[PDB]
Design a protein around this ligand. Structure first.
Ligand SMILES: [Zn+2]
Ligand SMILES: [Zn+2]
Ligand SMILES: [Zn+2]
Ligand SMILES: [Zn+2]
Ligand SMILES: [Zn+2]
Ligand SMILES: [Zn+2]
Lengths: 328, 156, 48, 165, 86, 145, 131, 171, 56
């Protein structure tokens, strides 16, 4: 039979532009807000509204229509949902990138640790390709442990020219598990965990020119977007619910992990809402971070693997796209 | 629950130091800004809601409970030009219940401003005067011991 | 109804249809759920 | 490539006609040109001027009622199927046109072009029959603070002075 | 149109390539199979591919090959003017 | 009380309702048995998914945390600690704990799997009711068995 | 009433961008925000307690003098001077006639301000403006 | 409002029309696929100007379709609506929700909430009409309507108007 | 590049750097399911009206 006729022009894809979602884009693009970690109502007859298998996200059955586009399984491409995270969480695939960006800018004002006043930095900023420019900047900036509120003038080293700074000592950043821990040296060194909110706030203060020199794009990818605040929910087609004999229903591994994310998010939201001493909050944050990290990548060095009831490791998105049998 | 809610609104500040002990105090610059913004936001929210309600009501479908605006309904009417037919349900549309609320929202705004009058008067005087930001050490200058033998060492 | 809409952009007259393998659609959707934005465009932006 | 996705709301009162209806237009050749707006009478003359030309091409290779029939028979003869929309326009233009012959419209164009108004405004002024300066100021809000009532009052009088029939 | 090289200074090979011949025969054969007007006299033939081959031999294919260059420029070559030597 | 969202396959040409429909699984086609018109193509069959029985556990999707090819005991211990401190799963854990004890009791007497499935189902149906609030849990489990 | 809209009470302290407007029909203060909502789509009755005089958005203007009573007189004076307008040369230098003419115009303005004879005087204004 | 615009279209020709008179078929296709058509970006395309001198560029054969894609540049008269504009039309249909005014190729709908309070719906009169002390609005009546809102789709445009402002309604 | 090895790692770097792909390679076109610009696809077959008219 084929797909129905469409009035839109028929065109060929010419360019592909990669980027990162903004939190506003995920909320605007999404058609429904997921707030229930269930999939079927109490009667197990129809999918519960607001659940993982919300009818608004599309249909994967030959007998049901999509509540959004009113089209069958063979025409609906799927509609994305979104989950409003209680607290920002790191992106598992950008933790290394986040660490390099943190060491490149001051952790109190969001300004580059080295300005154009340094000859070595001047040549680094002259590099055209972004990937190598970022590496050169990181090498120069990662060894600067102070903001240098005042810098010697370039005309001569006698007088000092004032530059935007705070004179605040920078920490030595290391990655422990899924958390970034910075250590300050005294005038044993003090150690504390850098909260995801603190990193997000610092990243939002980086000037437009500052992170462009780091290889980021003002519109397509900004450092603030590398921290997840709103999580898009893939539609049922991406995570179909297979059946063995049509009398027993099975759910995709993504649905199992997504349900855990909803349960963890609600648990964290309820905790901090009333009581919940700070010790419990950090444990709840770590659990949410672990669930999200394993959802996108279940093979993380030094971390436990999210295992299924049968004992098989959960098949995350990274596993699907990688390997000889992967999507590519 | 009381501290957590009063902490989210930043009307009460927390300070943790090793003696890990937890101390609570009031940060005047933070509380005033939060009160000033929330009061402005609350008034703005009512004003925006009143403005929105002054617009035509719209339409809704009794079956699928889908909101349809005046413009959206105009493209869904039947070929006979007699009733608005729902795209999903192919059923006549029913007018929404938002016509009489126009007066209710206005009344609430009028009552709220009279009740919030002392806050507005206090804020005007606060901006006129010079506000000094408080700190734990500064707050210690006005310390009244709570107990004769309090376990907490009120020192910085 | 011969109607198209892209919620978030607020446009209904800038829609295009393309033919891609269903696996390719799955890949892009999987990437979108992974915070990556694979954007498909019909017009060139840079010269060869 | 920039997906700014910001668009100003269209509005006739603010003269924000959109993005594809800007004042400075580019023709097929590529030279910049000013947007041309046609009033109800001007559109009627232009449309049927092409229909008669269209009739000549194929062949080579008055009161309202009689004119309506003549256009109707001409419309079907010189146009193909699915002309239901064109029929409605010509019928609507004949019953709401204020200028019959080319001479009257030519004088009107030479008249209103001295104001220096926007093409949208002049077309609206030549499209809607207004009797008083206040009538045009409220029905066409864009005219406010753009032309004095003195000039507007005489322009309306002169426009009605050469009123058809 | 700065990307269209004028016919007076075309520098591409004047011989139809195997890939050009393959697509021209296939494209013309597809058109014939969809009831396209045949511009060559048929001495008895039903296969669209064979009819296309007959047209190419007599140089009666109304198509031009737009050869693209690695910078976006192109040259237009008519099937009639392209020598079929392979 | 909700949107229909139902798809019914009928032949436009034949218009006979109900229609005779034959599902050619081998050819992946749904064809009208009267005129031969194909009504739908590219039908799908009816690892990456898990099958659970929604009669003894209802709708409850959960994932355990365990060691992998490389893992530190610190993360596993604390992550398991965080998972236990959940309020939503506590209510269902009592029912799950009851199933675990029933399985142990049923498995210690050498009984078929059908009995424990029936016993677990009986417990779930009769659990969370006002009548069964003053009886010992041992009596409830024995009665269900 | 010092700096707050009589309807929405949007004080300048919280909304410094607020701008006030007045309408000649009843000379009632109202902020710009209220004007657009109530009169954008058409004429509406004045939203005041005790005032039922309809007004249009296009008639709103910015108050010049801080006193409403003086504003009414000046606008009436402008309206009258658009019809009753003469100069000393109009009477060939006859100061006695000009002074009497000026007093009559002032008397008319006084009657309009206080509504002594609104019906009779208004007809007189209409009668004179034609010729 | 009526405008003269320079428009471009992509026309597809089946190989069956690849004859010596194929250009004429393109002209016929343009008049059969453009005239009387509705576009959300340019409004209702009514008439094609300079029908003898359309600029037809060289066609490109599609890879698998087998049809030729031609870019065509032409000058056409288009009626494009805009909110805030005042137009005149004739009422065609009447209903409780409101009446519909015919303005050229477009139908403007006047809602009750956008209608003056005095006007009221009276279904007793045949045909149904809106009756008021000063005037009566019925089918075939001439109404001056101000377009209050416009929603444009890729192939359909709908607008709503009001007659509450002064100098609107019955003419 | 992601088609050969380190598929996910390469894609993550593209998102962070906002890399632009011109789809001038065979791999991009194969993934997108469109005729690659190779062999018979290195050119566009067009219609010739100048020669079409003179043939008949
Ligand atoms: Zn859908
Ligand atoms: Zn700093
Ligand atoms: Zn409905
Ligand atoms: Zn049949
Ligand atoms: Zn106000
Ligand atoms: Zn008043």
């Amino acid at each position: 039979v084929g797909q129905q006729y469409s009035s839109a022009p028929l065109r060929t894809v010419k360019e592909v532009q990669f980027g990162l979602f903004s939190p506003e884009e995920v909320r605007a693009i999404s058609v429904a807000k997921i707030r229930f970690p269930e999939t079927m109502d109490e009667t197990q007859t129809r999918a519960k509204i607001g659940g993982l298998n919300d009818p608004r996200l599309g249909s994967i059955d030959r007998n049901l229509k999509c509540q959004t586009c009113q089209e069958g399984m063979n025409e609906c491409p799927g509609h994305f949902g979104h989950i409003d995270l209680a607290k920002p969480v790191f992106h598992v695939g950008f933790i290394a990138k986040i660490k390099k960006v943190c060491e490149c800018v001051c952790m109190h004002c969001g300004k580059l640790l080295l300005d154009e006043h340094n000859e070595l930095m001047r040549q680094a900023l002259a590099i055209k390709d972004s990937k190598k420019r970022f590496a050169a900047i990181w090498t120069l900036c990662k060894t600067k442990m102070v903001c240098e509120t005042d810098v010697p003038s370039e005309d001569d080293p006698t007088q000092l020219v004032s530059r935007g700074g705070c004179g605040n000592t920078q920490p030595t950043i290391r990655k422990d598990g899924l958390k970034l821990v910075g250590s300050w040296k005294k005038d044993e060194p003090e150690l504390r965990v850098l909260s995801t909110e603190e990193i997000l706030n610092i990243f939002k203060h980086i000037s437009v020119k500052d992170f462009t020199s780091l290889g980021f794009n003002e519109v397509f990818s900004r450092p603030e977007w590398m921290i997840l605040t709103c999580l898009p929910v893939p539609p049922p087609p991406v995570r179909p619910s297979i059946s063995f004999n049509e009398s027993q229903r099975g759910e995709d591994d993504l649905t199992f992990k997504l349900a855990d994310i909803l349960k963890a998010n609600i648990s964290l939201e309820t905790l901090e809402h009333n009581g919940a001493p700070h010790h419990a909050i950090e444990e709840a944050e770590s659990l949410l971070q672990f669930h999200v990290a394993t959802y996108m990548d279940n093979d993380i060095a030094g971390q436990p693997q999210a295992l299924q009831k049968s004992g098989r490791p959960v098949k995350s998105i990274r596993a699907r796209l990688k390997g000889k049998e992967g999507r590519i | 629950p009381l501290i957590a809610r009063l902490r989210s609104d930043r009307l009460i500040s927390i300070h943790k130091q090793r003696e890990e002990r937890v101390y609570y105090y009031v940060k005047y610059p933070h509380a005033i800004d939060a009160i000033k913004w929330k009061v402005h936001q609350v008034v703005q929210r009512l004003k925006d809601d009143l403005d929105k309600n002054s617009e035509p009501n719209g339409y809704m479908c009794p079956i699928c409970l889908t909101k349809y605006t005046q413009l959206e309904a105009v493209q869904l009417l039947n070929f006979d030009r007699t009733e608005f037919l729902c795209s999903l349900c192919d059923e006549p549309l029913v007018e929404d219940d938002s016509g009489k609320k126009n007066k209710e929202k206005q009344d609430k705004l009028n009552r709220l401003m009279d009740q919030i009058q002392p806050i507005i008067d206090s804020l005007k005087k606060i901006d006129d005067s010079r506000i000094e930001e408080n700190t734990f050490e500064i707050a210690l200058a006005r310390l009244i011991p709570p107990q004769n033998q309090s376990h907490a060492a009120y020192t910085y | 109804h011969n109607q198209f809409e892209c919620k978030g952009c607020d446009n209904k007259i800038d829609i295009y249809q393309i033919h891609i393998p269903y696996a390719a659609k799955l890949l892009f959707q999987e990437l979108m759920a992974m915070n990556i934005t694979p954007r498909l465009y019909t017009d060139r932006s840079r010269d060869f | 490539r920039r997906l700014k996705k910001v668009e100003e709301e269209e509005n006739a009162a603010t003269l924000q006609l959109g993005q594809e209806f800007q004042l400075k237009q580019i023709n097929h050749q590529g030279e910049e040109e000013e947007l041309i707006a046609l009033n109800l009478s001007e559109a009627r003359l232009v449309i049927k001027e092409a229909l008669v030309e269209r009739r000549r091409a194929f062949k080579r290779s008055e009161t309202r009622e009689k004119e309506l029939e003549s256009i109707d028979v001409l419309l079907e003869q010189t146009t193909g199927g699915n002309n239901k929309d064109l029929k409605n326009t010509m019928q609507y233009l004949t019953n709401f046109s204020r200028f019959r012959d080319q001479e009257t419209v030519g004088a009107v164009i030479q008249l209103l072009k001295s104001t220096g108004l926007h093409p949208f405004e002049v077309a609206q002024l030549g499209s809607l029959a207004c009797d008083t300066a206040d009538e045009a100021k409220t029905l066409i809000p864009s005219l406010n603070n753009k032309i004095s009532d003195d000039e507007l009052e005489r322009i309306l009088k002169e426009l009605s002075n050469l009123e058809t029939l | 149109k700065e990307k269209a090289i004028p016919k007076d200074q075309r520098a591409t090979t004047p011989y139809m390539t195997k890939y050009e011949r393959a697509r021209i025969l296939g494209t013309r054969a597809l058109q014939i199979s969809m009831n396209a007007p045949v511009f060559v006299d048929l001495e008895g033939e039903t296969d669209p591919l064979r009819i296309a081959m007959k047209e190419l031999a007599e140089k009666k294919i109304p198509l031009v090959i737009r050869r693209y260059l690695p910078d976006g420029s192109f040259e237009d070559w008519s099937v009639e003017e392209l020598i079929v030597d392979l | 009380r909700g949107p229909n969202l139902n798809i019914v396959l009928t032949c436009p040409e034949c218009k006979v309702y109900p229609p005779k429909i034959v599902e050619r699984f081998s050819e992946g086609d749904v064809v009208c048995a009267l005129c031969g018109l194909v009504l739908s193509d590219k039908l799908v069959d009816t690892r990456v998914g898990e099958a659970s029985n929604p009669l003894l556990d209802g709708n409850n999707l959960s994932t355990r945390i365990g060691k992998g090819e490389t893992t530190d005991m610190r993360f596993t211990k604390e992550l398991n600690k965080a998972q236990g401190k959940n309020v939503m799963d506590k209510k269902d854990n009592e029912v799950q704990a009851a199933f675990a004890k029933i399985t142990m009791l049923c498995d210690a007497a050498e009984l078929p799997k059908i009995v424990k499935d029936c016993a677990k189902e009986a417990y779930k149906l009769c659990h969370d009711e006002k009548t069964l609030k003053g009886k010992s849990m041992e009596s409830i489990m024995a009665a269900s068995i | 009433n010092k700096d707050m809209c009589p309807i929405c009470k949007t004080d300048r302290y919280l909304s410094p961008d607020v701008k006030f407007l007045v309408n000649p029909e009843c000379y009632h203060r109202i902020c710009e925000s209220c004007v657009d909502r109530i009169f954008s789509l058409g004429p509406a009755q004045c939203p005041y307690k005790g005032c039922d005089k309809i007004l249009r958005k296009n008639k709103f203007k910015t108050q010049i003098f801080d006193d409403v009573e003086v504003e009414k007189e000046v606008d009436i004076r402008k309206r009258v001077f658009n019809v009753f307008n003469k100069t000393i040369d109009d009477f060939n230098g006859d100061l006695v006639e000009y002074n009497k003419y000026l007093e009559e115009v002032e008397d008319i303005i006084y009657k309009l301000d206080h509504g002594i004879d609104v019906a009779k005087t208004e007809e007189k204004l209409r009668t004179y403006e034609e010729l | 409002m009526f405008f003269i615009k320079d428009l471009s279209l992509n026309i597809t020709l089946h190989p069956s029309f690849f004859g010596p008179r194929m250009k004429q078929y393109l002209k016929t296709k343009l008049l059969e696929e453009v005239e009387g058509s509705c576009t959300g970006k340019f409004g209702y395309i009514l008439c094609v100007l300079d029908y003898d001198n359309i600029d037809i560029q060289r066609g490109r054969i599609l890879p698998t379709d087998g049809s030729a894609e031609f870019n065509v540049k032409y000058r056409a008269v288009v009626f494009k609506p805009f909110k805030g504009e005042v137009v005149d039309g004739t009422v065609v249909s009447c209903s409780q929700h409101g009446f519909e005014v015919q303005v050229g190729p477009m139908k403007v709908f006047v809602t009750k909430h956008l209608m003056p309070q005095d006007l009221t719906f009276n279904a007793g009169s045949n045909p149904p009409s809106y009756q008021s002390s000063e005037d009566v609005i019925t089918i075939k009546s001439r109404i001056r309507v101000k377009i209050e809102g416009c929603i444009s789709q890729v192939s359909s445009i709908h607008a709503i108007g009001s007659i509450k402002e002064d100098y609107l309604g019955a003419i | 590049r992601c088609s050969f090895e380190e598929t996910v790692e390469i894609l993550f770097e593209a998102g962070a750097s906002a890399e632009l792909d011109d789809c001038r390679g065979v791999s991009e076109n194969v993934i997108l399911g469109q005729m690659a610009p190779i062999g018979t696809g290195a050119f566009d077959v067009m219609i010739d009206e100048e020669s079409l008219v003179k043939y008949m």
